[PDB]
Design a protein around this nucleic acid. Sequence first.
DNA 1: GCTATGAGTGGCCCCTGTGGAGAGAAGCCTGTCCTGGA
DNA 2: GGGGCCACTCATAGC
RNA 3: CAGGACAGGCUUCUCUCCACAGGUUUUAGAGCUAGAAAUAGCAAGUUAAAAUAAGGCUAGUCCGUUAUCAACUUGAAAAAGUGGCACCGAGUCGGUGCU
Length: 1015
Amino acid sequence: MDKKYSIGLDIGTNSVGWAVITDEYKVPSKKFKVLGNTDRHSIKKNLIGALLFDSGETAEATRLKRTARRRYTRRKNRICYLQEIFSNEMAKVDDSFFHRLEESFLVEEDKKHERHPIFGNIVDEVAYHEKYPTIYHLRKKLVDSTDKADLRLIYLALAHMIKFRGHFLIEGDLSDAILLSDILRVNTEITKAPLSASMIKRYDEHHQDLTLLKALVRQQLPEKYKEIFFDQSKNGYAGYIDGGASQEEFYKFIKPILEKMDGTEELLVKLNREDLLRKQRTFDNGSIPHQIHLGELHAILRRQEDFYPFLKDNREKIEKILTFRIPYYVGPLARGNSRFAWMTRKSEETITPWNFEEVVDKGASAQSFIERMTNFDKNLPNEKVLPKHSLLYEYFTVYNELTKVKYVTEGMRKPAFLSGEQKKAIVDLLFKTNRKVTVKQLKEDYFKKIECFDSVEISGVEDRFNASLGTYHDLLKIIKDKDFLDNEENEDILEDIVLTLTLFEDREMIEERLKTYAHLFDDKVMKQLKRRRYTGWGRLSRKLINGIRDKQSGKTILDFLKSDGFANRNFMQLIHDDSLTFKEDIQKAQVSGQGDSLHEHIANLAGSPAIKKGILQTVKVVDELVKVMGRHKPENIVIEFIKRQLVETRQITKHVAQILDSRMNTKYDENDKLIREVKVITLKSKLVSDFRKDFQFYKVREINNYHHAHDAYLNAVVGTALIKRDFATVRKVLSMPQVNIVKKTEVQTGGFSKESILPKRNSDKLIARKKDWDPKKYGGFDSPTVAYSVLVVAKVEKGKSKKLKSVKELLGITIMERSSFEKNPIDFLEAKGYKEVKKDLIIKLPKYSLFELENGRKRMLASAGELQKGNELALPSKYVNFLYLASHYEKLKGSPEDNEQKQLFVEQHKHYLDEIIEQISEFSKRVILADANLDKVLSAYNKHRDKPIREQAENIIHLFTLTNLGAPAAFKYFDTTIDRKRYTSTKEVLDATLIHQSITGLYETRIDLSQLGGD
DNA sequence: GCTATGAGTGGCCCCTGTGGAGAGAAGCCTGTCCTGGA
DNA sequence: GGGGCCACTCATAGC
RNA sequence: CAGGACAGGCUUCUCUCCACAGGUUUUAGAGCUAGAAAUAGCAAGUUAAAAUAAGGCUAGUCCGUUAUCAACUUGAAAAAGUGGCACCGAGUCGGUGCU
């Protein structure tokens, strides 16, 4: 028999509940065949469970990293351009200078030339470091002096300016003096480069203050001198300079010291101003306009161009390189092979900063940038939507609000529809002359004045007309020619002008396109038009409203709004009327596009990708549940911190509804109407919560993971209750211990390792940053991420004698080696010293792979060297009820009688606490093996045994954190903190039972490792 | 008897900050309304 | 919040 | 009754592109004096280069952390196919009968 069965669902952010029940609230149980090589051939399981998986991630970080990579690449390209310009003369002075610049990061053993980067000899380097202690001194020297300097110093200064050219927030060239004063604290020192003067002044103040502080400290507190000037570990000056301490840390540490001594008034004031001992490369410099650097560059080039012809002949190139920037409406410069590129090319030469404007069509680039993201019209998927400020759109809005305005005058039996002449007269008299029009204004100015209807009753509008001809008023203010605005032949020209003013944002390109239409207006109008900008887009297309014409009458939807006779069909009525070809045109335009895959259709929805993942997982769960029951289709499907999580929980319902309804019923009747064999019911959680609260089925999110399954089961029960012993059946179902809980196996992806680059050490677990940079000499990354684990059976030459030893262990692959591993596993396994590879025994072990051990103890393979708790705790319902009522003993919100009775029930069964502790201890002994922590918990229990009941319950709820699924977590019990017990040994599972589970946990194949790899 | 290697227990660490431009989606209220059920 | 790493201590095989 | 559409305000979030300021790492910036060395005293400390996921071929001023992923058979892959039912009981499921 096709037993009537229903599928209930509870959809969360990371969990998917599923349940199958009969017509009488019972969950059938089946005997399932079990594959593998073990003895257990058949296992009986209930048709109830739940699924858990990791939260989905937004694509923000990948985009950020991509933008950063592009920043780095473009900066290096600019440096390469500068070296390309300079290299010709460099060979005549010192040909190996650029080699030394590139090869500085290596040790002296790996340097191909002398170790000194700048001059190549120690005397000149010392002289340079003495004469110019900081680069700002060299910059000021080149700006102010008239001396012929060595080209190397010029290159150094120019490269330093180019690599750190500063921001672009300010437009044009350079109350403003106050902004400069905030940027530039220099007062009167007469030079063209104030920034260098400010930095030098800060350096001098730092030097003098350091000398004074050394003097005073050595005078009065000799003992603290060592801490301040030698100890790198503390937040003192040594830490501020040679350590990692920040400025605020240094000020906070130095504040009490200066308070203890005299003569520190000015130093304390400077500390209050954050001006004491301040570096040159700080987080303050973000506010520097790039025009200062441009001016310094220009001054240096102007002063030095009289000695070096190539500097003079290439000054424009250098200024461009400093000032060149790719417009934000162009995008990446790729030849089609990049999925983010939309640039259109005039030719195929290499793009350089000196010829960018000739190769890339900026206008077409902006058009493609704007168009590729705009919505398409739903009714006509082949057309773009008009701008919201378009004239036809405003006319459509005004008339559509006016279309259903019904007017009643004295002597008229029924409300009448406005005539096209009336519509046009009203619009011309009020809307084209007033920005906002109310009902009283209409009554006074059209009915009373024009048609002499002194009293009129107007229905359909209460207060006013929200539509407005704002664009009309703006164009009348600019053009000041009503005849030009009212011309029908200029409607195309006006629409083109509006579209041009809406698409682009640059003044130059807007002028460029509108230059073809300057023949109609003066220069003042063109400039006034130039400054006008509009944003936003509509929801309808031009072709729908005024482009497609009814072949019988030739009218458009615009004409139907203006003049259709007594019918006065509005926008909703015009599309649904069968007398017009427009609805036939709509159905024809419903392109039978290639059926989006369920993945694609889910990916096409609105929300974070995590909710889409949840949708796909729920659909696959439903599909497998249907497959299990003999492919007989079901009757009914009943479906249901940080804010976005619950937002997505409420957002799931509708989409799950239409996707399930679409896939389920695919058969149409003889009239092409869909025969709906499946009923989709959406219910909000409040009804289920009320059902829970009325019948004492409390929900505790801290005990275990059966709450999802119970929520789904109650969802199905309550949903089927309205469309169609019972409480006894529910109570029997809820206390069932065997529930299918499944953890989804995953292959980890992401960054190769952590980002903190650590100093050099003598260890084998450091990762090089390049191909030829041994970490023992240069340090590197740490903590690589495990991709997945493979079981290997082979022989290893061990010991100093290199003796072959047959082995069986786990070797986890890092994400950096996944491609290398799957390219040729034999070569990779030979690389790590394993020989006589047993290819047939390679087993894929992703994260959360499950192993079964004796006494039912289970472990999930968290990584190549760590395990997680896999066994689940099952508690009787009475203990759950007692614990919940105890935890909210004083938080009960209800009638006094029931609250007092529940509190009395809590009072009576205090002996439950010992039973709860004993059962927790037994479960921990049997599956957790946490003897020391268990003893600590037991000792703490007896210690606080006189505490009030509610506090006892609150502390007990914390205990289940030790027994929950996943990685062990620390928890607090009264005043005691319990450390986390971590399993760092994976050897015990090499001879255990390996289990593969279906996505619902019913189909499974068991593999025993004790037989694999045997001699 | 000496040294080296695994094996358990406790402890410390994990890149940050902003500007400019656009497009879209969702939810909450008022007006105007439709499509299905019943 | 959760997995890699290190310092210290300690049992044991090789020798 | 549920869902849906167009306008007028309120809020929150998502997707794409263009820039800037840091931080980290190694090296360079002759430490001295006394002492055989361990070590003790003195002195100085603000800056610079390179890299910032290993790299790849389609060689671009491009791409590299989004999503998808139980097992077996066909398939390069996408993709497709592959596993009995009923009845009684319940500590991670057990028992009874049929096929």
